[PDB]
């Protein structure tokens with residue numbers, strides 16, 4: 001995954017738990033020979049998994065919980081790190097932003113060539129609900145989507161409820177989320 005993801009995890013932990021805790025995690029992740037993450041450079045996915053795994057152990061929180069927090073953090077973090085305009089061009093409401101999600105990831109995809117973005121499809125079921133279909137080349141990142149959706153809720157002063165209804169882990173084709181919103 002691109003450096004920006006690892007920078008954000010790093011930033012999230014440093015800001016909440018301090019520089020020492022970050023170093024402890026860094027060490028345990030097996031990444032002490034890396035002084036900084038380069039935001040526009042592609043890293044092996046392993047870097048991210050090892051980071052999250054290491055932080056799970058050092059912080060005493062399950063990985064899935066950290067992925068949720070990371071998901072929430074990302075919406076705010078990107079607006080401050082080069083993507084404020086891009087975010088604003090994706091919409092004025094949550095359902096609109098969700099429709100534009102592939103588009104948004106493609107507009108990053110011009111900048112970042114070796115991107116492997118997820119694919120999202122919205123089936124609207126009412127003016128206050130939708131089904132969100134999530135397909136990915138990667139495993140175990142559905143909890144991250146849950147945090148992203150709450151981030152977006154916060155962004156749009158919109159109350160939101162997200163419940164996963166289908167899991168790859170039980171053998172379903174792809175993850176599906178039921179979403180209700182203000």
Ligand code: HEM
Nearest residue numbers: 001002078083087108115116117118136137138141145148
């Ligand atoms: C400007 C805002 C956003 C930017 C700049 C952005 C950019 C990125 C980038 C660079 C990656 C890594 C892809 C790779 O390295 O292959 C990624 C991954 C991902 N994105 Fe976003 N993204 C944004 C918003 C969102 C939102 C709102 C969602 C809501 C569901 C989302 C869902 C995901 C998921 C689930 C992944 C994990 C990769 C995977 O599933 O394969 N992104 N994003």
